Amino acid sequence: EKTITIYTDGAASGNPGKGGWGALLMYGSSRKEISGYDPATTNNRMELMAAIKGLEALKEPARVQLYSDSAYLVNAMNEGWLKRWVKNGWKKPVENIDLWQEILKLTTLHRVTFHKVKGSDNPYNSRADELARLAIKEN
């Protein structure tokens, strides 16, 4: 029954290169931070992974407001593309089908609204970005 706000970010050095992701989960004054590293990845993959991991961190089904700088993510969800991809057999082939399948599952468990942020945008996405970069630096 909770509405949880999640701020997600991913970063990678190159295409492909070392990458990281971060998410900040917020419920009133409560906060939870998560992050991780991937040794060979793309910006798009880390953007999706941040959202996946953020949603996976929820302990119970929730209503979620998810803030991301990722147009890749947010457009797929808000322009109906993901739903059309599934309907058309993931095609030519959509990239990152493994991650989109996870996002399909998680957006059944949780009722998620996605919001695009512009970059910098607020301190919570900034923290998520810092956490993603932190993961790369630690590795």
User: At its nearest, how many Å lie between Mg ion and the CB of residue 42?
Assistant: 12
**Which has the closest alpha carbon to 4: 63, 55, 87?**
63
Phi and psi dihedrals of 31, rounded to 5? -135, 150
Q: For the stretch 29-45, what's the b/e string if a residue is b when 16 or more beta carbons lie within 10 angstroms of its beta carbon?
A: eeeeebbbbbeebbbbb
| Nearest-approach distance from CB 129 to Mg ion, in angstroms | 8
Per CB under 5 A, 41 contacts Mg ion: no
Please say which residue, 35 or 68, places its beta carbon nearer to Mg ion.
68
Selected binder of Mg ion within 35, 41, 42, 70 (CB under 5 A): 70
Pick the closer one to Mg ion by CB: 58 or 70: 70
Interaction site with Mg ion (CB under 5 A): 9-10, 47, 68-70
